[PDB]
Amino acid sequence: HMEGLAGYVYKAASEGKVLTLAALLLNRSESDIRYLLGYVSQQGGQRSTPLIIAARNGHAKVVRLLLEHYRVQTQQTGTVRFDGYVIDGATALWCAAGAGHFEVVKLLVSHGANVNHTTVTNSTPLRAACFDGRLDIVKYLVENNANISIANKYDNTCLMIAAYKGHTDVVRYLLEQRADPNAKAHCGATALHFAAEAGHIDIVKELIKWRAAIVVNGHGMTPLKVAAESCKADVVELLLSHADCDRRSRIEALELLGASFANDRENYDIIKTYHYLYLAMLERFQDGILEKEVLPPIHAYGNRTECRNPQELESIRQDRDALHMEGLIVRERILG
Amino acid sequence: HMEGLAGYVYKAASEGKVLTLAALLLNRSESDIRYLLGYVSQQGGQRSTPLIIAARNGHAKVVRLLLEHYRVQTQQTGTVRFDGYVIDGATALWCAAGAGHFEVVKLLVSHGANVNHTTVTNSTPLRAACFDGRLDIVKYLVENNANISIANKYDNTCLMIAAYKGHTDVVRYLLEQRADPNAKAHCGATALHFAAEAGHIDIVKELIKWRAAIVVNGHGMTPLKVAAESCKADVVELLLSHADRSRIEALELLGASFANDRENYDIIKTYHYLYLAMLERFQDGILEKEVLPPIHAYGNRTECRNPQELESIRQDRDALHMEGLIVRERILG
Ligand SMILES: O=C(Nc1ccc(F)cc1)c1cccs1
Ligand SMILES: O=C(Nc1ccc(F)cc1)c1cccs1
C-alpha cells in the first residue's frame, strides 16, 4: 500500500532532510497526508511518527515544517529508545527533552505542546530534563507552566532524581521555584536521602538552606545513616553539624561510617575505619556512659569480637587485618 | 651520659650519611660501639636501632659499614612505621623488604639475616615483599630459603596478599615456586576468594591452572559468590566455566549487585543476570524459591517469580533497581 510511501516520509524526517520531506508531501491529498504523517513506523525497537523521530533526533529544521504548514497534532505518543532502555508513551516533546534538543523543545511548546503529558512511568518532559540535568530545558518548561510537582509512578519527583544524578544547579533552581524538598517516594526516600547516598555535598547544603526536614527513610534509616553506610564521610559530618541526638543516634552514624570504610573494597581505608570507630567510643564514656551489646564471635570472622572499651579498640590500632574485620562485624550488628 | 652521641649516630644512620656515621664510631671501644649501635631510639611510637633505620630508609652504604666493619647483629628488632601502621618485631631485613630496598635486602641476608624471622603479627620479609609486590626481592628471598608457607597471625599466606593487592607477577612466581593455593585464613578465605573480591582476572586464571576453592571468605561463600557480590562480572563468568542451584545463585547475586553497587552500577546488567538466572526456582514443591513478602523498604514490589514477570519490568529504571535490592537481601541479609 502507501505503507511504502510512509517509509520514505519517516526516513526523511528521522535524518532531517527538510528538502526531501517537502518534496514527498507536496502534492498530497489531506486524507493521504494524515496517513503519511500519522503512520506508526517500526524501526528497531521504536514505534514512532515522523514528528516524534524528528524531535528525538533534534532536527528542528524538520519539526518546524510539520507544525507550521502541515499542522501536525503535537499530542502524538510512541515508544522510542533512549540509550538502552525502551520508553513507551513518549511524546515528541518528551523525546526532545530527554535528548536535550534545546530548539525542538522551544518550538513544540511554543506551538502549543502539552508540557505535562507523561510516559507510562509518568515521567514528564521536565523530569527527563531533570534526569539529564539540562538546565536550559528545566528553566524553559517551568516558566512555560510545567508542573514541577507531578512525579513518576514511584512518587520519585524531578527534585529527587536531580539530586541522585547530582545536578547541583538544576536542584537549586527547583528549590527556588519552591519545589517541596520533603516529598517521599514509594521507597520512602527524600530528596536528601538520595543526595546523601551519592554524596552530593553541595546539593545536601542547598536542600538544608531551603528548610528541608529530617525524616526517617520511611522504610529504613535517616539521611545521615544512608550517608554513613554509603561511606560519604564529608556528607556524614555536614549533617552532624545540624540537630542530632546528643550521643545516641549521633554515635551510631560514626560507628557505621567507620564500619563502611572497612567493608567495601572500593574506598577501603582501615585508618579511618579506626578513626571514626574510636571517636565513637570517646563519645560513649565522656561524662556520666553508654556501652554496646556485642554479638558472639561468630565462627566466620575468625573469633574476633567487637570492642567494648576504648583501650580495647586502641590495642588494634596496629593491626590492619583485625581492624578490617572489626569493621565487618561492627557493620553486621547494625545491619543484620 | 653518652646518650647524646648515641642520638647523633642514629641521625647519621637514618639520613644515610655513611661518612658522618663512620666519623662518630671510629675511636670508640667495642663496649661503646655496642651502646651507640644498640640504642633503641623513640621517635613517636617507634623503637629503632641505627641499623634498622638504615635499612628502612634503604641507605645501603651505611648498612654495609655497619655489618662489615662494626659487625652489628642482624637479630636486632624494633617497632617501625610504614603505610601508617606501627609494626612491632621488625628487623632491618623485614623493613628493607616492605620498603622494596633491593640492595639492603641483598646486603643483610649475605651477612646472615634470618629470612624467616616474623613480626609480632608473624609477617615474613617474604610476606612484606609480597604485599608491596616487589618481584626482585620476592625471588631473592625465596632463593635464599624463605618459607612461602609461614603466614600471618590469621593464616594469611604470601599467596593471599599477592592476590588481594593484585601482583600478578608475584602470584605467578609463588605458584611456580609451588605455593599452596588451597590454604585458608581464619576467615576461611582462600587465595581465590581474595582475587575474586578485587576481580584480579589475570590472577584468577593463574590460580585456576592449579587450585580448587572451598567455601567461606568470612560469610560462607564460594569464590564465585564473592565475585558476584563484589559485582566482578568478568571474574564471575571465568569461574562460571566449571562445575555447577549454585549457578543460579551466582547469576542472581551478580545481577542483584549491579543495582545497589553505586560504584559499578548498571541497571541494564541487573536485568540480564537476573533474567538468565530464571530457569528453575519458584513454581515447584524447577525447584523451590521462597520470596520475601513485600517489605516497606524496596517499596512494596515483590520479587519476580516467573520469567514473564521480569519481562514486563525489562523497562523502568526505578523498578529494576529495587528488584536488585530484593534479590540481594534474599541471598544475604
Ligand atoms: O527521564 C527519564 N529517563 C531518561 C530519558 C532520556 C534520557 F536521555 C535520560 C534519562 C526517566 C526516569 C524515570 C522514568 S523516565
Ligand atoms: O603487609 C605488611 N606490611 C607492609 C605492607 C606494605 C608495605 F608497603 C610495607 C609493609 C604486613 C606487616 C605485618 C603483617 S602484613
From Swiss-Prot, chain B:
UniProtKB keywords: ANK repeat, Apoptosis, Cytoplasm, Metal-binding, Nucleus, Repeat, TPR repeat, Ubl conjugation pathway, Zinc
GO terms (BP aspect): apoptotic process; branching involved in prostate gland morphogenesis; epithelial cell maturation involved in prostate gland development; proteasome-mediated ubiquitin-dependent protein catabolic process; protein ubiquitination; regulation of DNA damage checkpoint; regulation of extrinsic apoptotic signaling pathway via death domain receptors; regulation of ubiquitin-protein transferase activity
Pathway recorded for this protein: Protein modification; protein ubiquitination
Location(s) in or outside the cell: Cytoplasm; Nucleus
Residues binding Zn(2+): C187
A Gene Ontology molecular function term of the record: metal ion binding
Tissue specificity as recorded in UniProt: Widely expressed. Highly expressed in testis. Weakly expressed in other tissues.
Residues bound to Zn(2+) 1: H186
GO cellular component: Cul2-RING ubiquitin ligase complex; cytoplasm; cytosol; mitochondrion; nucleoplasm; nucleus; ubiquitin ligase complex
Annotated ANK repeat ranges: 46-75, 88-117, 121-150, 154-183, 187-216, 219-246
Main location: cytoplasm
Resulting phenotype, F131A: Abolished binding to -Gly-Leu-Asp-Arg C-degron at the C-terminus
Plastid found in the keyword field: no
Effect on the protein of changing F194A: Strongly reduced binding to -Gly-Leu-Asp-Arg C-degron at the C-terminus
Modes of activity regulation: Activity of the CRL2(FEM1B) complex toward FNIP1 is inhibited by BEX family proteins (BEX1, BEX2, BEX3, BEX4 and/or BEX5) in absence of reductive stress. Mechanistically, BEX proteins act as pseudosubstrate inhibitors that associate with FEM1B via zinc in absence of reductive stress, thereby preventing association between FEM1B and FNIP1.
Subunit structure: Component of a CRL2 E3 ubiquitin-protein ligase complex, also named ECS (Elongin BC-CUL2/5-SOCS-box protein) complex, composed of CUL2, Elongin BC (ELOB and ELOC), RBX1 and substrate-specific adapter FEM1B. Homooligomer. Interacts with PPM1F and PHTF1. Interacts with the death domain of FAS/TNFRSF6 and TNFRSF1A. Interacts with CHEK1. Interacts with NKX3-1.
Function recorded in the entry: Substrate-recognition component of a Cul2-RING (CRL2) E3 ubiquitin-protein ligase complex of the DesCEND (destruction via C-end degrons) pathway, which recognizes a C-degron located at the extreme C terminus of target proteins, leading to their ubiquitination and degradation. The C-degron recognized by the DesCEND pathway is usually a motif of less than ten residues and can be present in full-length proteins, truncated proteins or proteolytically cleaved forms.
Family as reported in the entry's similarity comment: Belongs to the fem-1 family.
Protein name: Protein fem-1 homolog B
Protein species of origin: Homo sapiens (Human)
Parent sequence residues shown: 1 to 337 of 627
